[PDB]
Amino acid sequence: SMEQVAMELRLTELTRLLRSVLDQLQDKDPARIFAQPVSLKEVPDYLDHIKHPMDFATMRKRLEAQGYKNLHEFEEDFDLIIDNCMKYNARDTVFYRAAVRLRDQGGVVLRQARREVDSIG
């Protein structure tokens, strides 16, 4: 059907918008603390602490498989990256502080993205 192609053109454009948003969020992590999954070889107890690990590379795989249906889904994954880090690492650590900064800075990008997803449709 034609509608299915229209829908897919919308999913495709959203994917285009989310890719740009993802790139902008990742630029706010110049240290690359959030680039890849936490290593279970190097943090073998990690899953005792964190039930749903997330990281920018895992978000990118989903993105390119058009696995985000809406912005809310994408934001959930971004908030996991932040929230997991602030639970696992203590307040006084480089890791926790990087998550605070990513959160604050990411907020501006996400605010405009929401207006663009609404505005474009």
UniProtKB/Swiss-Prot annotation:
Q: Which residues form the signal peptide?
A: none
Q: Classify the source by domain of life.
A: Eukaryota
Where is it expressed, tissue-wise? Highly expressed in testis.
Covalent cross-link site, Glycyl lysine isopeptide (Lys-Gly) (interchain with G-Cter in SUMO2): 41
> Which cellular compartments is it found in?
Nucleus; Chromosome
- Annotated Bromo domain residues: 9-113
Q: What does the UniProt function comment say about this protein?
A: Scaffold subunit of various histone acetyltransferase (HAT) complexes, such as the MOZ/MORF and HBO1 complexes, that acts as a regulator of hematopoiesis. Plays a key role in HBO1 complex by directing KAT7/HBO1 specificity towards histone H3 'Lys-14' acetylation (H3K14ac), thereby promoting erythroid differentiation.
Subunit notes for this chain? Component of some HBO1 complex composed of KAT7/HBO1, MEAF6, ING4 and BRD1/BRPF2. Component of the MOZ/MORF complex composed at least of ING5, KAT6A, KAT6B, MEAF6 and one of BRPF1, BRD1/BRPF2 and BRPF3. Interacts (via PHD-type zinc finger domain) with unmodified histone H3. Interacts (via PWWP domain) with dimethylated and trimethylated 'Lys-79' on histone H3.
In Swiss-Prot or TrEMBL terms, this protein is called Bromodomain-containing protein 1
> What organism is the protein native to?
Homo sapiens
